[PDB]
Design an enzyme around this catalytic site. Structure first.
Site, PDB file in Angstrom:
ATOM      1  N   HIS A 152       0.807  -1.229   0.000  1.00  0.00           N
ATOM      2  CA  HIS A 152       0.000   0.000   0.000  1.00  0.00           C
ATOM      3  C   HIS A 152       0.838   1.276   0.000  1.00  0.00           C
ATOM      4  CE1 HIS A 152       0.088  -0.339   4.602  1.00  0.00           C
ATOM      5  NE2 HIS A 152       0.404   0.935   4.426  1.00  0.00           N
TER       6      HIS A 152
ATOM      7  N   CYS B 280       4.176   1.082   9.386  1.00  0.00           N
ATOM      8  CA  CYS B 280       4.049   0.005   8.416  1.00  0.00           C
ATOM      9  C   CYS B 280       5.401  -0.392   7.831  1.00  0.00           C
ATOM     10  CB  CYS B 280       3.084   0.388   7.298  1.00  0.00           C
ATOM     11  SG  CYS B 280       1.409   0.380   7.876  1.00  0.00           S
TER      12      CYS B 280
ATOM     13  N   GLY C 234       3.217   5.621  10.311  1.00  0.00           N
ATOM     14  CA  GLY C 234       4.536   5.452   9.745  1.00  0.00           C
ATOM     15  C   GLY C 234       5.210   4.155  10.151  1.00  0.00           C
TER      16      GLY C 234
HETATM   17  C1  LIG Z   1       1.039   2.152   8.061  1.00  0.00           C
HETATM   18  O1  LIG Z   1       0.999   2.783   6.799  1.00  0.00           O
HETATM   19  C2  LIG Z   1      -0.273   2.333   8.807  1.00  0.00           C
HETATM   20  C3  LIG Z   1      -0.180   1.808  10.236  1.00  0.00           C
HETATM   21  C4  LIG Z   1      -1.342   2.297  11.089  1.00  0.00           C
HETATM   22  C5  LIG Z   1      -1.268   3.768  11.463  1.00  0.00           C
HETATM   23  C6  LIG Z   1      -1.816   3.840  12.875  1.00  0.00           C
HETATM   24  N1  LIG Z   1      -1.627   2.484  13.373  1.00  0.00           N
HETATM   25  C7  LIG Z   1      -1.486   1.587  12.422  1.00  0.00           C
HETATM   26  O2  LIG Z   1      -1.498   0.371  12.586  1.00  0.00           O
HETATM   27  N2  LIG Z   1      -1.325   1.617   8.086  1.00  0.00           N
HETATM   28  C8  LIG Z   1      -2.388   2.217   7.546  1.00  0.00           C
HETATM   29  O3  LIG Z   1      -2.564   3.431   7.579  1.00  0.00           O
HETATM   30  C9  LIG Z   1      -3.424   1.314   6.881  1.00  0.00           C
HETATM   31  C10 LIG Z   1      -3.077   1.063   5.416  1.00  0.00           C
HETATM   32  C11 LIG Z   1      -4.242   0.572   4.559  1.00  0.00           C
HETATM   33  C12 LIG Z   1      -3.776   0.234   3.154  1.00  0.00           C
HETATM   34  C13 LIG Z   1      -4.914  -0.630   5.199  1.00  0.00           C
HETATM   35  N3  LIG Z   1      -4.751   1.879   6.976  1.00  0.00           N
HETATM   36  C14 LIG Z   1      -5.543   1.607   8.022  1.00  0.00           C
HETATM   37  O4  LIG Z   1      -5.177   1.096   9.056  1.00  0.00           O
HETATM   38  O5  LIG Z   1      -6.809   1.980   7.730  1.00  0.00           O
HETATM   39  C15 LIG Z   1      -7.781   2.001   8.794  1.00  0.00           C
HETATM   40  C16 LIG Z   1      -8.028   0.566   9.213  1.00  0.00           C
HETATM   41  C17 LIG Z   1      -7.901  -0.422   8.053  1.00  0.00           C
HETATM   42  C18 LIG Z   1      -8.670  -1.640   8.564  1.00  0.00           C
HETATM   43  C19 LIG Z   1      -9.665  -1.051   9.517  1.00  0.00           C
HETATM   44  O6  LIG Z   1     -10.548  -1.646  10.116  1.00  0.00           O
HETATM   45  N4  LIG Z   1      -9.391   0.250   9.635  1.00  0.00           N
HETATM   46  C20 LIG Z   1     -10.355   1.213  10.143  1.00  0.00           C
HETATM   47  C21 LIG Z   1      -9.992   1.766  11.496  1.00  0.00           C
HETATM   48  C22 LIG Z   1      -9.060   1.133  12.298  1.00  0.00           C
HETATM   49  C23 LIG Z   1      -8.734   1.649  13.535  1.00  0.00           C
HETATM   50  C24 LIG Z   1      -9.331   2.800  13.995  1.00  0.00           C
HETATM   51  C25 LIG Z   1     -10.262   3.424  13.197  1.00  0.00           C
HETATM   52 CL1  LIG Z   1     -11.032   4.881  13.757  1.00  0.00          CL
HETATM   53  C26 LIG Z   1     -10.594   2.919  11.960  1.00  0.00           C
END
Ligand SMILES: *[C@@H](O)[C@H](C[C@@H]1CCNC1=O)NC(=O)[C@H](CC(C)C)NC(=O)OC[C@@H]1CCC(=O)N1Cc1cccc(Cl)c1
Ligand SMILES: *[C@@H](O)[C@H](C[C@@H]1CCNC1=O)NC(=O)[C@H](CC(C)C)NC(=O)OC[C@@H]1CCC(=O)N1Cc1cccc(Cl)c1
Lengths: 299, 298
Positions: free
Chosen positions: A39, A143, A141
């Site tokens: 991603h 990931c 950051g």
């Molecule tokens: C690395 O790029 C980050 C790591 C994140 C940042 C904060 N903590 C982490 O683990 N990864 C992301 O930003 C992902 C990347 C996409 C391509 C999956 N995005 C992400 O986590 O989107 C939100 C997540 C995805 C699955 C889900 O259920 N999500 C909705 C969510 C999760 C947690 C809290 C809230 Cl309010 C919504």
């Protein structure tokens, strides 16, 4: 007993950053390949339901910035393997350790080297939960941070970080890009299964108590593995597998207590409770120490 | 949330094996000097009342075997500073990081790189207890393992491991060889002073529990600083100083919970217990996260 990570230096020497546009995450540099979450190629709009194959076709090698520190590593090829991007680079990492890529089972533990902009911040031990999530400390950051174990001088890489779930737990892949659990790399809300207690690690913990002379909870009986699993399910404990019975072998041999006898002892604790008593100084059973973790800190 | 150690690589590149007679332990190789516990110069019989100045003058350089992996390093000088032996070698460690030697205060935390036979085996976070012990994981052969913090690219070494007490806690020195606490490098059963709980860290940890969505323990009660400290001391908790209140400001701001309100919550926990409940997964109040340790992660 402490949660103890492996020394991180062999993995620190493999951490890089990978940037597409303004999006930067961490990559793993082994020989002449850099591995990172696919991603990194996604824009904001692309992240709702990306077409990764179409996004990658538009990418050329010269659209990828890979840096070790401030030093650029030139990309000379790119491919996608499941949810991981593989970037061929023109320099073999001189700090490449002996390594393998392993896919761990739920309940197993590993060290995470939490990294930001290709720079490590901290190292800690994580247990993969029975529902394939982990409880890390992962900020934006993070990931591409990896999880690993070290056996002798060989680094077994088992996890790459991709996402957070609504409950605050984390999900990612093995180093072949295959997610642990029923998750996808889309920024949609996703639900983990109901979590359960890691039975094999609780059993390891009971063996650890016996090794330290704390054995009040040992009873004179045994049980079948199916009997235990049916009972255990009623207390939100993970059913045991044959692999679990096998990894308890060293601790069973160390103590002379058959695995199924310890299962009977645990069954009794679950049904009757601790009745005011403690095990290893605690009123709670611990489930984040594997048989291997127990042998490392006792022996 | 998560106890986290500093990345250990910079320290791993300094660990070597030091052997004298039948005793082997770990050394720290910085520039052209290897630092290790002086009790390596002791036999089994020496350890009971060892006259280290006498034992040391009777050693020659060739009595010390220093190995960095597959390579023996030649010892060309030896001296002693308090309880640390210093072995001058003929080669400089090219992996020496920028470093300082610091003496840490009780209540502060640091990372431990546990080593055996000169090889790194594990990394974890420890606090220097008010009674100057540490709750580590150290087995036979762990002596000379070091504790450190990293600030930028500079490694501040603050601990070198020497002994285990009969209660299973651990004691050692700074890199100047001065023990933390009233301990002595001799094979005798030694007890530590009464331990007390690091109150500012328990408060930092409660703020961490609040930030992570755990708040069953909060209350609308409040307290003065002195009345909190009266109750703290009753339960063998350290008094909270105004400098500790100050250090909690960032966490107080972030959560909107006054420091003295969190003190009122902690008072209620000490007096009542947790009533079966848990905080951040623990049945016990945790005191080995500093305010800084919590901020960095939250
Ligand atoms: C690395 O790029 C980050 C790591 C994140 C940042 C904060 N903590 C982490 O683990 N990864 C992301 O930003 C992902 C990347 C996409 C391509 C999956 N995005 C992400 O986590 O989107 C939100 C997540 C995805 C699955 C889900 O259920 N999500 C909705 C969510 C999760 C947690 C809290 C809230 Cl309010 C919504
Ligand atoms: C490194 O050389 C070690 C490793 C120890 C033993 C396993 N865990 C450790 O931390 N340290 C020692 O062997 C020291 C060396 C002397 C010169 C101080 N000795 C030691 O720790 O053993 C005796 C200790 C010293 C203080 C004390 O209270 N001791 C008596 C003791 C403590 C705990 C249990 C028992 Cl059976 C005896």
């Amino acid at each position: 007993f402490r949660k103890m990570a492996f020394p991180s230096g062999k993995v620190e020497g493999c951490m890089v950053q990978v940037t597409c546009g303004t999006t930067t995450l961490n990559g793993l540099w082994l020989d002449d390949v850099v591995y990172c979450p696919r991603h990194v190629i996604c824009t904001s709009e692309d992240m709702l339901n990306p077409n990764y194959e179409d996004l990658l076709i538009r990418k050329s090698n010269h659209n990828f910035l890979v840096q070790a520190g401030n030093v650029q590593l030139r990309v000379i090829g790119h491919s996608m393997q499941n949810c991981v991007l593989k970037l061929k680079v023109d320099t073999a990492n001189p700090k490449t350790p002996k390594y393998k890529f392993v896919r761990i089972q739920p309940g197993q533990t590993f060290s995470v080297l939490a990294c930001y902009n290709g720079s490590p911040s901290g190292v800690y031990q994580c247990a993969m939960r029975p529902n394939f999530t982990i409880k890390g400390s992962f900020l934006n950051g993070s990931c591409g941070s990896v999880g690993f174990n070290i056996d002798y001088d060989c680094v077994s890489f088992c996890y790459m970080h991709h996402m957070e779930l609504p409950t605050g737990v984390h999900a990612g892949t093995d180093l072949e890009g295959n997610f642990y659990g029923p998750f996808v790399d889309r920024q949609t809300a996703q639900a983990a299964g109901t979590d359960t207690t890691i039975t094999v690690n609780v059993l390891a913990w009971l063996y650890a108590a016996v090794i330290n002379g704390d054995r009040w909870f040992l009873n004179r009986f045994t049980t079948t593995l199916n009997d235990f699993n049916l009972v255990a399910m009623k207390y939100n404990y993970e059913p045991l597998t044959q692999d679990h019975v096998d990894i308890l072998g060293p601790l069973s041999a160390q103590t002379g207590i058959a695995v199924l006898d310890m299962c009977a002892s645990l069954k009794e604790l679950l049904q009757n409770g601790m009745n005011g008593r403690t095990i290893l100084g605690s009123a709670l059973l611990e489930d984040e120490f594997t048989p291997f973790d127990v042998v490392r800190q006792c022996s």
